[PDB]
Amino acid sequence: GFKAERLRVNLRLVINRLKLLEKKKTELAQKARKEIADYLAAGKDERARIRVEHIIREDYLVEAMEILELYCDLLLARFGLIQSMKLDSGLAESVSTLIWAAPRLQSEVAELKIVADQLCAKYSKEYGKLCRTNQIGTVNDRLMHKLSVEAPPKILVERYLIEIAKNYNVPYEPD
Amino acid sequence: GFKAERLRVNLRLVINRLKLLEKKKTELAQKARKEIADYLAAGKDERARIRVEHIIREDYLVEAMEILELYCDLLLARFGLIQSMKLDSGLAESVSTLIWAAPRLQSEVAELKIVADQLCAKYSKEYGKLCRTNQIGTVNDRLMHKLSVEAPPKILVERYLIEIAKNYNVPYEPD
């Protein structure tokens, strides 16, 4: 049961929700950068080294919500193309990536579920699973990576620490 | 002709030079983000899309100078280990990456040449070329990538544009 109005409404609600969360998480991460500055000055460098990984995860998550927002923007911008026919290859990445990211992020942005669901209804649930587990190969690599909750590289962490150190004028201790 | 004092002196001069350039390039990039905000408001979005790639290159370069600075920090911190014996595997990445990055960056940081040269003198010029063309496989992947002057991904550019748009409160036009 594909409803074209249902899709646009929720695509819109998603943009609004992303905008909000991006702003929130950027604030939360900024206070966390300050908290780490306190550890680095203390310090407390093994604690800074462990905690700064949360900041790396938050920042990636913000960038991921941005990319999603872009994809909602580009879908709404070419919403005529959506319906119909019938999928345009120019919107392939946008549609696939949104179906992919939905299960992961519907924890915070609920409407993202409806967006993926409606996109499925328009292009079949066969297309649905080809995306959700990237078998179709159109889902954005950099976006998936930002949502890949694995371990951050040593140098990225170091880096985060030397930048916080420079910003807040605290001393930095190498590893 | 390895001189241990020559190495530390230049390792130190490099840190000072990196610190300076990082600060400069961050300033230059900030004005460039403002210039693009003007295009986005204009706009002028195909011009913004082309010019914002310079900002992406500058930011990567800054992150690369940071990583280098870290490696100079960690070399100086374990300078006893350097001389001698004789190379410690804990300092392998730091030494290799610095020898690697030197030819690329001695355009701006001249002393980086002497640092690589002295590091070569301590560990042979055979080790020198194993690094300069990453045959040794210890040179840092993320650092090389940041100095890889290739084309930025579509989504990274978009992204840069949507962030500048959000920051400077200008409208954003999708692709």
From Swiss-Prot, chains A, B:
Post-translational modification Phosphotyrosine, affected residues: 39
Main location: cytoplasm
Subcellular location: Cytoplasmic vesicle; Cytoplasm, Cytoskeleton, Microtubule organizing center, Centrosome; Midbody; Nucleus envelope
GO molecular function, one term: protein-containing complex binding
Keyword Phosphoprotein among record annotations: yes
Region entry Interaction with CHMP1A and CHMP1B, spans: 1-163
Keyword annotations: Cell cycle, Cell division, Cytoplasm, Cytoplasmic vesicle, Cytoskeleton, Nucleus, Phosphoprotein
Keyword Translocase: no
One cellular component (GO) term of this entry: midbody
Signal peptide (from-to): none
GO biological process, one term: positive regulation of collateral sprouting
Family note: Belongs to the IST1 family.
Subunit structure and binding partners: Interacts with CHMP1A, CHMP1B, VPS4A and VTA1. Interacts with SPAST, STAMBP, and USP8. May interact with VPS37B. May associate with the ESCRT-I complex. Interacts with MITD1, in competition with VSP4. Interacts with SPART (via MIT domain); leading to the recruitment of SPART to midbodies. Interacts with SPAST.
Function: ESCRT-III-like protein involved in cytokinesis, nuclear envelope reassembly and endosomal tubulation. Is required for efficient abscission during cytokinesis. Involved in recruiting VPS4A and/or VPS4B to the midbody of dividing cells. During late anaphase, involved in nuclear envelope reassembly and mitotic spindle disassembly together with the ESCRT-III complex: IST1 acts by mediating the recruitment of SPAST to the nuclear membrane, leading to microtubule severing. Recruited to the reforming nuclear envelope (NE) during anaphase by LEMD2.
Name this polypeptide is given: IST1 homolog
Species the sequence originates in: Homo sapiens
